[PDB]
Amino acid sequence: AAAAAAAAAAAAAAAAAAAAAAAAAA
Amino acid sequence: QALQKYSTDLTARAREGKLDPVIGRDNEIRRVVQVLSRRTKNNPVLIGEPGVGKTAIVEGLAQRIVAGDVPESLRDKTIVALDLGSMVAGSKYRGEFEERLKAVLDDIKNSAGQIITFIDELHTIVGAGADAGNMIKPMLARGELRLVGATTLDEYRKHIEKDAALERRFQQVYVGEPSVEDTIGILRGLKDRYEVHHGV
Amino acid sequence: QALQKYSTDLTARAREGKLDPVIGRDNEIRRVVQVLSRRTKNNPVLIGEPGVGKTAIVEGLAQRIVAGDVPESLRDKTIVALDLGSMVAGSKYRGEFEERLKAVLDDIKNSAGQIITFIDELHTIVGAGAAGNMIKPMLARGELRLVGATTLDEYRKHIEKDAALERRFQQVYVGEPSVEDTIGILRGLKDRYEVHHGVRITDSALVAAATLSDRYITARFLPDKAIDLVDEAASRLRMEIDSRPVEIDEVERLVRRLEIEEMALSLAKLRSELADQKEKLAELTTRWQNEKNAKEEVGPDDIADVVSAWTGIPAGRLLEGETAKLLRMEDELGKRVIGQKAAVTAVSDAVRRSRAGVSDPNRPTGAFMFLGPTGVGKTELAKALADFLFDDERAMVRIDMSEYGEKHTVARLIGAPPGYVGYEAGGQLTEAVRRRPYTVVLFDEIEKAHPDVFDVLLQVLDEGRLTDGHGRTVDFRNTILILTSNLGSGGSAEQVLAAVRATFKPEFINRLDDVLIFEGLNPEELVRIVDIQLAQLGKRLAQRRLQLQVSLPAKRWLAQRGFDPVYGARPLRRLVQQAIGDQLAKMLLAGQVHDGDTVPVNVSPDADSL
Amino acid sequence: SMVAGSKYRGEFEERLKAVLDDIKNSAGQIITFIDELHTIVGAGATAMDAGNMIKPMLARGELRLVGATTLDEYRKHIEKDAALERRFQQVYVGEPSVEDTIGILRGLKDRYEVHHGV
Amino acid sequence: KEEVGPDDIADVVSAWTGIPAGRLLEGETAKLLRMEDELGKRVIGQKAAVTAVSDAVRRSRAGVSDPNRPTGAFMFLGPTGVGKTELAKALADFLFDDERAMVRIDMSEYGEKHTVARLIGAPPGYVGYEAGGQLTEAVRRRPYTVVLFDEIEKAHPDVFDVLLQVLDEGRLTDGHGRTVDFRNTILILTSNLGSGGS
Amino acid sequence: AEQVLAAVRATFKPEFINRLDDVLIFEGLNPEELVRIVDIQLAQLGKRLAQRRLQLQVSLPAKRWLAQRGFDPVYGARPLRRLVQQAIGDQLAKMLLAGQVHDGDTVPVNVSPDADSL
Amino acid sequence: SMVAGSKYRGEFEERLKAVLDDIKNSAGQIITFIDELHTIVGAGADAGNMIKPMLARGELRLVGATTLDEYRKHIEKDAALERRFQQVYVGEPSVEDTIGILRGLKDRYEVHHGV
Ligand SMILES: Nc1ncnc2c1ncn2[C@@H]1O[C@H](COP(=O)(O)OP(=O)(O)OP(O)(O)=S)[C@@H](O)[C@H]1O
Numbered sequence A: 001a002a003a004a005a006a007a008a009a010a011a012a013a014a015a016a017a018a019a020a021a022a023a024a025a026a
Numbered sequence B: 001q002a003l004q005k006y007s008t009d010l011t012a013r014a015r016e017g018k019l020d021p022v023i024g025r026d027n028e029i030r031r032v033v034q035v036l037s038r039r040t041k042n043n044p045v046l047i048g049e050p051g052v053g054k055t056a057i058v059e060g061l062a063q064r065i066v067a068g069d070v071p072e073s074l075r076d077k078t079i080v081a082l083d084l085g086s087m088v089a090g091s092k093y094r095g096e097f098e099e100r101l102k103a104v105l106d107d108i109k110n111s112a113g114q115i116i117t118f119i120d121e122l123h124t125i126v127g128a129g130a131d132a133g134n135m136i137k138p139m140l141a142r143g144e145l146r147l148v149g150a151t152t153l154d155e156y157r158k159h160i161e162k163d164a165a166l167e168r169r170f171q172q173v174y175v176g177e178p179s180v181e182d183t184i185g186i187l188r189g190l191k192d193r194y195e196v197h198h199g200v
Numbered sequence C: 001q002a003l004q005k006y007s008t009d010l011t012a013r014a015r016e017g018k019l020d021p022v023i024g025r026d027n028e029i030r031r032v033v034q035v036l037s038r039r040t041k042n043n044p045v046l047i048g049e050p051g052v053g054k055t056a057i058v059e060g061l062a063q064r065i066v067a068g069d070v071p072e073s074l075r076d077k078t079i080v081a082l083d084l085g086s087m088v089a090g091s092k093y094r095g096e097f098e099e100r101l102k103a104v105l106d107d108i109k110n111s112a113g114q115i116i117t118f119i120d121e122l123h124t125i126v127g128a129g130a131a132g133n134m135i136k137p138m139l140a141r142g143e144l145r146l147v148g149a150t151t152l153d154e155y156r157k158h159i160e161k162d163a164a165l166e167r168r169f170q171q172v173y174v175g176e177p178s179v180e181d182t183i184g185i186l187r188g189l190k191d192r193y194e195v196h197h198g199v200r201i202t203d204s205a206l207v208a209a210a211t212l213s214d215r216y217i218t219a220r221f222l223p224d225k226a227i228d229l230v231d232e233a234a235s236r237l238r239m240e241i242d243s244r245p246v247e248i249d250e251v252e253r254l255v256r257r258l259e260i261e262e263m264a265l266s267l268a269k270l271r272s273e274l275a276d277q278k279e280k281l282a283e284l285t286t287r288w289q290n291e292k293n294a295k296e297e298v299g300p301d302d303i304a305d306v307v308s309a310w311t312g313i314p315a316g317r318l319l320e321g322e323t324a325k326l327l328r329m330e331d332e333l334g335k336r337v338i339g340q341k342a343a344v345t346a347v348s349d350a351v352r353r354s355r356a357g358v359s360d361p362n363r364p365t366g367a368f369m370f371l372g373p374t375g376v377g378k379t380e381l382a383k384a385l386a387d388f389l390f391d392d393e394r395a396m397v398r399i400d401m402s403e404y405g406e407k408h409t410v411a412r413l414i415g416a417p418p419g420y421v422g423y424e425a426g427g428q429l430t431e432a433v434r435r436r437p438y439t440v441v442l443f444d445e446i447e448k449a450h451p452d453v454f455d456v457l458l459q460v461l462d463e464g465r466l467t468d469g470h471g472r473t474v475d476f477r478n479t480i481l482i483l484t485s486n487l488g489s490g491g492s493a494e495q496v497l498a499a500v501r502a503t504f505k506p507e508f509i510n511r512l513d514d515v516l517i518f519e520g521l522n523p524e525e526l527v528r529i530v531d532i533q534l535a536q537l538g539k540r541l542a543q544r545r546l547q548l549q550v551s552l553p554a555k556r557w558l559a560q561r562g563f564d565p566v567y568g569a570r571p572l573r574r575l576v577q578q579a580i581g582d583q584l585a586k587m588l589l590a591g592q593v594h595d596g597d598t599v600p601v602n603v604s605p606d607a608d609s610l
Numbered sequence D: 001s002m003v004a005g006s007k008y009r010g011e012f013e014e015r016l017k018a019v020l021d022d023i024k025n026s027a028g029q030i031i032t033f034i035d036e037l038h039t040i041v042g043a044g045a046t047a048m049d050a051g052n053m054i055k056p057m058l059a060r061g062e063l064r065l066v067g068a069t070t071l072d073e074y075r076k077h078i079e080k081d082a083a084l085e086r087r088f089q090q091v092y093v094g095e096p097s098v099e100d101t102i103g104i105l106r107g108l109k110d111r112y113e114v115h116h117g118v
Numbered sequence E: 001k002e003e004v005g006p007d008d009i010a011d012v013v014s015a016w017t018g019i020p021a022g023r024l025l026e027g028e029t030a031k032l033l034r035m036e037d038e039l040g041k042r043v044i045g046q047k048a049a050v051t052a053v054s055d056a057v058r059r060s061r062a063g064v065s066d067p068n069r070p071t072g073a074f075m076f077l078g079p080t081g082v083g084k085t086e087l088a089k090a091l092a093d094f095l096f097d098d099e100r101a102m103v104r105i106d107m108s109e110y111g112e113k114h115t116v117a118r119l120i121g122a123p124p125g126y127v128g129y130e131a132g133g134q135l136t137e138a139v140r141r142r143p144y145t146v147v148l149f150d151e152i153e154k155a156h157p158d159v160f161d162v163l164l165q166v167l168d169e170g171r172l173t174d175g176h177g178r179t180v181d182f183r184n185t186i187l188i189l190t191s192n193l194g195s196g197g198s
Numbered sequence F: 001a002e003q004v005l006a007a008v009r010a011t012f013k014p015e016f017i018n019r020l021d022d023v024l025i026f027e028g029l030n031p032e033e034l035v036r037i038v039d040i041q042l043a044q045l046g047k048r049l050a051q052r053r054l055q056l057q058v059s060l061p062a063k064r065w066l067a068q069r070g071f072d073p074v075y076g077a078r079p080l081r082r083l084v085q086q087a088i089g090d091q092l093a094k095m096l097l098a099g100q101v102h103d104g105d106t107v108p109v110n111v112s113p114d115a116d117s118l
Numbered sequence G: 001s002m003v004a005g006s007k008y009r010g011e012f013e014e015r016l017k018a019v020l021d022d023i024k025n026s027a028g029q030i031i032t033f034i035d036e037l038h039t040i041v042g043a044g045a046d047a048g049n050m051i052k053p054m055l056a057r058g059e060l061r062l063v064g065a066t067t068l069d070e071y072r073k074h075i076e077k078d079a080a081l082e083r084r085f086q087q088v089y090v091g092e093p094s095v096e097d098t099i100g101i102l103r104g105l106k107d108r109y110e111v112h113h114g115v
């Protein structure tokens, strides 16, 4: 005679980043 | 009868003059009346950058219904503003939320289209799951429940346009900001309300 | 008994005439039927982009089973669609939902081959339990029939990720139609919308609404896109079928408004505009009556007005008012740009063209670079062009490419690729034209941009549309692209062209319109700038009742001692404030020059005093 | 102390709505004061539902909600969600100079004599 | 005073956003009357180039200024050791009652073509994205500060291209997509070119 | 022949030569092969004008009058496609908006040494 | 050990509130010591953020210890906390101090190895 009580959740996945690396052009 | 417990009633508040008067914008009111009275897929969405007045259009529609300037098959159809915050109050068990939502939808469909629902800020309608907010999908396209909404322009493309099965069943009604020349008329209209609250 | 309780019945509503005919699409009907009559693995799944019609195919199948045009072993089947909403309702106990599912599957088991289960949007079944797993021994024994239909991307996100079931599903691609078959579909749906309203539909509307929705409205797919314009033009006509029409309504509401304001103020002014508006409203009213003395169906114009009011793009039948605009347009545009008549006559020649329906259907309607020396008006022109297309000058979409000096700064107009930091945000060009595309786009100083942004503008032109880092293709097919420069800066007419060929690739100049070249100014054409500056100055300080009196010797003197043909009209706008603005700015806060005054200027041999 | 233990599905939302109905119930008395209000945004991590629940209540002016956030933790969170940004007015508190900081220091020279008897 | 009027509206838009836009109600016109001579207590001489700096302030407080342009954007140069930095710190003294509340950037460091990004931000997807620019996020807080630009000779002619829409329009952008308005600040440019030309 | 295949062979890093097959040469804008291009473009323009029931009659002297500013075998046939909408387009657009070219009418071409008026 | 079992909402928060409430439940004799505190900024999922009013009110004594390289990468970028700490700087010593320290630890290794 018990119940179910559907529990919640939390999600996470981060992001990246890029770098440009200029070239001195000579 | 179940809508008494999970809703407000803008028509009942409009029938005692408790709404700020809406001045201007005949085009958007006529466009909402045009879209809301077609046969199927009859549910607009107000969209604009924030602050330009989008709740004001729905309150002006309520004023114009209670006055009576509408066409014939829009007369005396109360606008029952729904909620989704108050409906997930006690929802711990595995089947209470979906039962409550099905009771709400059954109570709407049991009428003869006499009710215009109004979910303000409907970009929260995707979540509340854990499925949920997906059992309303067949009811929208058949044309039973009339639904009027209001989003910002940039929460729309993040929460709704990700879910392209839903957004086909709407009608985007863009609302742009006015210039100065109409704002002078708006300010001349709303001058009397602040003179009464502040006695100046 | 439980299928009567939870689920639905298409065949119940099919025998009551409670659907619509599905005229068209014989091939996919026959394909689904023939897959369904296989000995084994008869689980079809419809996969296609949304809005092309997938529920309608199953409804046409139900209509055909009611009629009886099916092949052999499909007599009297009564297709039952399940309801996963009512499966989860009040089941707050422990072992209850799987027993409800087991009762329904037991009620499926007893009948041999009658019931065809139809679960719509079957990607919900992967979750929805905590269950929803009691399908594998069912489909391992061929009992369940399981016709379904999902959308295109939602299939591969869940079901192909969870591929233990997909081997028990044969797939059918659902094809979108084209312009030709959509007209034959709309002929078979006219007979219902006549009944639901009090209107009739001319076949000209069923041609024009199918043609006109292909070009302009680019977000949806063809079968349901065309129903929208008809079904809402019917509602607009039904609004006008009621007792009193439009316009007159517009003017009545407007004059009531101005009446309100005016009486509340009791401004003059408005008093005039009242009267004028009352003249107009009178005239129209009389005209109305006259006409009456002398429409009840949709024509061509109603579809045009629906597609014009929505999405902002003006496309009508040149409704008698803009003919006053588009012929006077040269003199009206020459109230802010003085001179450059050869340029106004070529800028004007791309709006009258594309308005009158003769222009190309895959091209930006105006794309032309104009350049020369400085202080001429090549920036003032665009902010004068956007002063009557929009009737306000702050409604311009303007970017400045004097900041894009390097390679990686493309991404502030095309957005980042997905899965990075800025992906909520999106671009600054892509997500500002997809919202109501009609605006005018600028590019200030295209010279100093890095020479790799230009390989994005090659498919902005010459194709009409571009992709981004999000997954959409916004189109610029009806904007006006404008490019500015100062290149050459000393060539007569051809060293400028040599510099343009030296800096730009020839395959970019090839795609443009006529590259205009501005000429400069003249001594006689400077006085007309002077009095515009002075009247603008009076309009600025029109707020303190402080109008001016400039004598014509002083206005002549302003033309002379700031002149040079090397800086344009910029030094005159500084010389005005060096002559007037010093003495006025000192004396105005020094008292004695109070409100309600017409202060003059008078010629002195160096200054001009007050 | 409101997202304290709320692992069940509707456990946080009725709690917050009970607090808000108690604030709305009384006759305009209670002026709330949330410190560090940039934590309003990411309240219930379910799909944005929480945090913008009080959005139809601030527009009618029902809870007076004095807050205090820093300058640079503001255009990272609240300007990201500009539908909330127009509900709030702004008061800009800049630093003083020495000429008033001397006066501010001279008045606090009593509590430090108590905690340290010097 | 029993009704509102056009003055208290200006009082509100002064006290919020910090821009002095009133009418000079009889108190501080006494200040701006004496500005060519009050400023002389810290700068001696240079009289023909104080009567012009003392004019873009008076014409902007009278209401004659061009409403889409910075209130004054002028460049002064000459030989060294004259007082061309001391002046631009002395007219930031009675407007603000301090001398450190000004945007003092130094363009003596922008020799190459990619130090634009420290004053304009970074496009989205890259490493420092939520940082803004150094020029941008010091104006948007209080849009009234005077701005220096010290030794503009040494900048590569790419920084001038960024500076070109600052003048004569008043707005630039950054990564977040906001157009910060320079419509009522006093730009000041220093130089040392020639240094002894006849 | 020589310099083209010398530049072609050098930009094939490994194994792009003997694993494709033979290389061909363009045959550009020529006077005999110029007419049918104008035929396709005029059929396209007639497709653009057949909606409002107006059509064209184009003669061969005008079709070779356009061949002066349509040959230019360096840049290509794109200024031809522009000048079709330049010379015909503005005259037609000027006439079509002020009435007088009422529906059901046809339009003939009329050769001039610089224009071609109607 | 405090993010041991948590895939929920509000699981870490109660587990932190019980520890802070057991600290301020007592009187002032529970001087705390978080070593390597550069893992106090993250750990959100908003967390490490119930501690900010408690720091600048004088409740928990909190002797901390960060390396200088990890400090300016994880804390100085998040400048609301940097006025809630005093920066005791420890420089490295010279030779004779190290000779004294090595004479200090001569005792222990003789126990650990019989040499
Ligand atoms: N046409 C109008 N007539 C009268 N009052 C108006 C009008 N437009 C706006 N207002 C007033 O201006 C305010 C508009 O606020 P809201 O319309 O509620 O903001 P909003 O449109 O809801 O935008 P968001 O993103 O939801 S905050 C209210 O105080 C209205 O009374």
Ligand SMILES: Nc1ncnc2c1ncn2[C@@H]1O[C@H](COP(=O)(O)OP(=O)(O)OP(O)(O)=S)[C@@H](O)[C@H]1O
Binding pocket: B141, B165, B168, C020, C021, C022, C023, C024, C025, C050, C051, C052, C053, C054, C055, C056, C150, C151, C185, C189, C223, C224
């Ligand atoms: N041949 C046809 N005859 C009549 N109506 C059609 C035909 N093809 C499509 N339609 C209509 O097009 C619409 C398609 O609606 P649905 O197929 O139910 O939506 P959908 O295409 O399945 O997209 P989703 O993912 O289910 S929301 C309905 O209005 C159909 O009546």
Ligand SMILES: Nc1ncnc2c1ncn2[C@@H]1O[C@H](COP(=O)(O)OP(=O)(O)OP(O)(O)=S)[C@@H](O)[C@H]1O
Binding pocket: C336, C337, C338, C339, C373, C374, C375, C376, C377, C378, C379, C380, C381, C486, C529, C568, C569, C570, C573
């Ligand atoms: N022919 C003209 N008629 C009217 N106003 C003009 C004219 N030429 C210039 N102006 C004025 O000059 C200003 C516009 O300067 P612009 O010519 O737009 O500078 P520009 O053309 O952008 O040159 P650059 O190199 O881009 S700064 C405005 O104040 C215009 O009113």
Ligand SMILES: Nc1ncnc2c1ncn2[C@@H]1O[C@H](COP(=O)(O)OP(=O)(O)OP(O)(O)=S)[C@@H](O)[C@H]1O
Binding pocket: E042, E043, E044, E045, E079, E080, E081, E082, E083, E084, E085, E086, E087, E191, E192
């Ligand atoms: N006329 C003057 N009145 C008062 N102080 C002056 C005057 N001329 C120079 N000084 C002082 O000279 C010092 C340096 O002047 P600065 O203006 O800082 O140098 P500069 O004029 O900027 O030249 P460069 O190009 O920057 S090296 C300061 O301490 C000033 O106070």
